[PDB]
């Protein structure tokens, strides 16, 4: 730190990063009279006392199940038109072949969505019915989602095609087409760099972007801990179901855990107290399960709302909120689909190679004081120039760069120099 | 009404609901016609069509159902939206 | 004696102070640049000009009123010092947890 | 209100205000067999007949315990560089001593 | 039953504290490391710094 020293970058870098987010969890269903009394007719008549509880547990689970479908729909089904990308893939030198659909594969998924789909190992592949058998025998069911996994891929394909062919215009009205190298110029202008920087470094920027994408692909395979957030959901659900099922072999103080064994070997009026003991234990087990599911559903909903907001604000626009869509100055984002979640790829701008200069707040020329319009004054030891604040590019000080205000008696660190007035030579 | 059996092959339903000792009004929903096989199970009492509309009652796994016009209940594959292409 | 115990946190109270001091030093010596890449230094009364320009006021208003703004800022900080103390609760959000 | 009248300010003020936010709570641990039964050996053998009513409590409380640390880290550990402020504390007239 | 009531109350309070902590982290990112234009987010007035 000093009070007349400033540092300015002379160079830049393009960066690509990732972000994982859960969206939905597993849908479940229960039947008390099968779970509690299995196939006994004597236990059904006794359970018929507690005739207002099972209705309530079933209502809770049904609510959760519907909320999951609502979550997924809110996140993905934002636009109601299915755009398509042109058959000639030339976009000014940028190379999007790693995020666009692959027609050769039987499932039209991009090369990265296959890595994402293979790195998350699931439990129930196939809903036409093992950790899924005994449960079904015990009254517990797993329901299939409403949107198959070949519909979500179409939605993400539509989003990508629209964004790379029209910009941000398709999220606020009718889609309007524009060349791609001339959309990146708008984005550069939006982060604070003049647009002639892109047209003069176009082939460097294209190469940097392509290399960044290559690294993104190679990195996911290694370090098998990227997908932790999406694996935790599966683990939690499986563990909860195992506990619930195995809880059926406890006596809770009775003489046995088998209903027919209790009914025989005892006379009715004291067999019934044992049976009621079992019934209360199992009801309490169900209620614990349902409460835990409700809390987890609330957490997943918070996450899904966050994901929907990121979709709206980073993919369909260009945000100025800091660190919302990655580290750096945001340029643009791309979505990808993953089991039970979504993945964002954020593309950002980073300054690279800085230098020292001395600076001043104003210039006194003829008793007037000049201030920069859109830049900052710098000196390299001998001469004074005016430059933009995010990229070193010096120019001469003229009456077109600066504006006048007052006289130079009041400003603290004012210095002396000349201002050009680009009119003398042309008329004289 | 239409009935959905969530985990069976309704070739093989009459053996699962024990259709032999049920009321003659339940046996209409065991073999009947309009049988259709989905991924969530399978469905009896609704007719499958080839159009695509937007979802009304969600059956699951991509299939939805509706009541429209002689009247009957139809089942179909939900549509995602119109098709369009930028130039 | 009944079986209920309390565990200590991972970050001690002297590490959080270091973190906040780092944030303050970075912000007052480099502005918003240190949060989006490498840190780049800039004089402070030439940082306030950028922020004024950002809220919609030309930047000569600062350079011509610099000494008034400095005094106003100092007085406001002193008042914070006094008020946090001499108001009754002022912290019932953090007392409620305990 | 009128249709050819406007009001424009001619002066300004610098305001400083505060905002308070909780970030974490206390970490707790519980032991069933001593809470429920105490130093009685006959109690534990009867307690064993409830399948698992302490494995679950332990898992729940441990989840809460680690979540607290995650909260604190996410709030404070934004930047992994430890900046320091220069020895000379002159910043154009502003006084950051407090 | 006493223990179970205790644990359930703890879970709910933990969820509330987590919502608050997420808000605090967002405020750190957007008020301290930058300059915000959202109204009444970073104080009442036109934001300068935090
Ligand atoms: C600005 O940064 C870029 C980033 O590399 C520099 O580009 C490299 O510069 C030289 C020129 O050919 C070579 O070492 C590399 O081949 C360039 N990059 C690549 C990817 O090939 C550029 O030189 C920098 N500009 C200045 C003036 O330093
Ligand atoms: C766009 O990226 C893809 C993926 O890296 C490139 O595909 C590689 O390009 C050549 C063509 O065979 C070979 O080096 C690799 O075998 C290709 N990989 C695959 C998986 O096909 C592609 O070349 C890039 N750009 C263009 C214009 O194709
Ligand atoms: C500071 O920068 C200025 C501008 O580049 C330098 O002045 C020019 O230096 C070039 C270098 O070849 C000369 O050809 C020019 O004659 C100089 N300016 C003019 C208008 O003729 C200056 O030399 C730099 N100072 C230092 C110490 O590097
Ligand atoms: C910029 O130029 C002005 C006028 O050319 C300088 O103002 C004079 O500075 C001298 C010091 O060398 C004083 O003795 C005069 O009283 C000043 N006022 C006049 C001559 O009217 C000013 O000092 C220059 N700025 C510098 C050197 O930083
Ligand atoms: C910056 O603010 C501090 C805090 O108010 C000032 O310290 C005071 O200085 C006066 C003059 O010596 C003392 O009478 C007070 O007791 C000090 N206050 C405290 C709390 O120690 C300081 O003077 C101000 N200016 C500078 C340059 O530090
Ligand atoms: C002439 C006059 O009253 N000027 C005012 C006075 O309140 C003080 O000098 C200053 C406070 O910063 O504000 C200005
Ligand atoms: C050089 C200048 O014009 N102003 C200041 C001056 O107070 C001193 O030289 C140093 C530390 O105070 O920082 C600079
Ligand atoms: C700026 O100049 C000083 C002069 O010694 C030097 O020590 C410092 O490293 C320079 N800063 C940069 C970023 O080059
Ligand atoms: C149901 O079972 C029959 C057995 O004959 C089988 O052919 C059919 O494919 C099964 N249904 C599904 C959806 O696989
Ligand atoms: C639906 O379409 C398929 C081919 O697309 C055809 O074979 C079938 O007969 C059609 N069914 C109806 C009911 O239209
Ligand atoms: C402004 O509003 C009312 C019109 O009803 C009246 O004061 C006056 O005629 C209006 N003036 C102009 C210029 O329209
Ligand atoms: C209000 O304006 C006066 C005159 O410009 C001056 O005191 C200052 O700008 C404002 N008042 C205060 C107390 O700062």
Residue numbers in the entry:
A (entry chain B): 704 to 832, 845 to 1143
B (entry chain A): 605 to 673, 686 to 703
C (entry chain C): 852 to 949
D (entry chain C): 704 to 801
E (entry chain C): 999 to 1048
Please give the exact wording used by the authors of the publication that reports this structure.
The spike mediates SARS-CoV-2 entry into human cells, induces humans’ neutralizing immune responses, and is the basis of current COVID-19 mRNA vaccines. The spike on mature virions is a clove-shaped homotrimer (i.e., its pre-fusion structure), with three receptor-binding S1 subunits sitting on top of a trimeric membrane-fusion S2 stalk. Each S1 subunit contains a receptor-binding domain (RBD) and an N-terminal domain (NTD). The RBD is present in two different conformations: standing up for receptor binding and lying down for immune evasion.
In this study, we determined the cryo-EM structure of the omicron spike ectodomain at 3.0 Å resolution. For the omicron spike, ~100% of the spike particles were in the open conformation, with one RBD in the standing up position and two RBDs in the lying down position; a 3.0 Å map was calculated for the omicron open spike, clearly defining the density of the standing up RBD. Further focused 3D classification was performed on those particles in the open conformation, also displaying that no omicron spike particles were in the closed conformation. Compared to the prototypic open spike, the omicron open spike had significantly increased buried interface between the lying-down RBDs and their neighboring NTD and between the S1 subunits and their neighboring S2. Structural overlay of the omicron open spike and prototypic open spike revealed that compared to the prototypic open spike, the NTD and the SD1 of the omicron open spike both shifted towards the neighboring S1 subunit. As a result of these domain movements, each of the lying-down RBDs packs more tightly with its neighboring NTD in the omicron open spike. Moreover, a partially disordered loop (i.e., loop 853 ) in S2 of the prototypic open spike becomes structurally ordered in the omicron open spike, mediating contacts between S1 and S2. Particularly, Asn856 in the prototypic spike becomes Lys853 in the omicron spike, which forms a hydrogen bond and a salt bridge with Thr569 and Asp565 from SD1, respectively. Moreover, Asn764 and Thr547 in the prototypic spike become Lys761 and Lys544 in the omicron spike, respectively: Lys761 is located in S2 and forms a hydrogen bond with the main chain of Gln311 from the NTD, whereas Lys544 is located in SD1 and forms a hydrogen bond and a salt bridge with Ser979 and Asp976 from S2, respectively. Numerous mutations in the omicron spike overlap with the regions that interact with neutralizing antibodies with high frequency.
